[PDB]
Amino acid sequence: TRDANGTWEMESNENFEGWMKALDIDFALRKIAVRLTLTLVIDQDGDNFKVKCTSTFANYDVDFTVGVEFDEYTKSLDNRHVKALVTWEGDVLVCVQKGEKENRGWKKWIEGDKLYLELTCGDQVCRQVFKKK
Numbered sequence: 001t002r003d004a005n006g007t008w009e010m011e012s013n014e015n016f017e018g019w020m021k022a023l024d025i026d027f028a029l030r031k032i033a034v035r036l037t038l039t040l041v042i043d044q045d046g047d048n049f050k051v052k053c054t055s056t057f058a059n060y061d062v063d064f065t066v067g068v069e070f071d072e073y074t075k076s077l078d079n080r081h082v083k084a085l086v087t088w089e090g091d092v093l094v095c096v097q098k099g100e101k102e103n104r105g106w107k108k109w110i111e112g113d114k115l116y117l118e119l120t121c122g123d124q125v126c127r128q129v130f131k132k133k
C-alpha cells in the first residue's frame with residue numbers, strides 16, 4: 001500500500017474547477033479540462049517516482065525522489081515555480097509545494113485497487129478517485 005505503481009483510470013473528480021480556479025488557471029482551460037479523460041501513470045522504484053498525467057490535450061509529468069526537495073515549474077498547469085517535497089506520513093504519500101500559493105500540494109492514499117488523491121490549493125480541495133487498470 002506504499003506501492004503506487006500502475007496505470008490509474010479516473011473514476012471520480014470532486015471540486016476540480018474550484019481547485020483550478022484557486023490556481024488561477026484560465027477559465028478557458030478549465031472549461032476544456034473538466035471534459036477530458038485523465039490517466040495517471042506511476043512508475044515507482046523505491047524512493048524514485050516518475051508520474052505522468054495524460055489527456056487529449058495536456059500532459060503533466062514529474063519525477064522526484066522521496067525526501068529530496070526539488071524545484072518544480074508547473075509549465076502545463078499554472079506556470080509557477082515551487083519548491084516541492086514528497087514524503088511518507090505512514091502510508092500516505094504527501095507533497096508540499098512551497099511558493100506563492102498557501103496550502104499547496106497533494107496527498108495520495110493507495111487502498112488496494114483504488115487510489116485516492118486530494119489536491120489542495122489555498123482554501124480549495126479537489127478529491128479524485130482512480131482505479132488500477
Ligand SMILES: *C/C=C/c1ccc2c(c1)C(C)(C)c1cc(N(CC)CC)ccc1-2
Nearest residue numbers: 033038053054055058059060106108117
Ligand atoms: C499523485 C498525483 C498527483 C497529481 C499531480 C498533478 C496532476 C494530477 C495529479 C492530475 C491527474 C489531477 C492532473 C491533471 C492536470 N490536468 C488538468 C488540470 C490534466 C493533465 C494537471 C496536473 C495534474
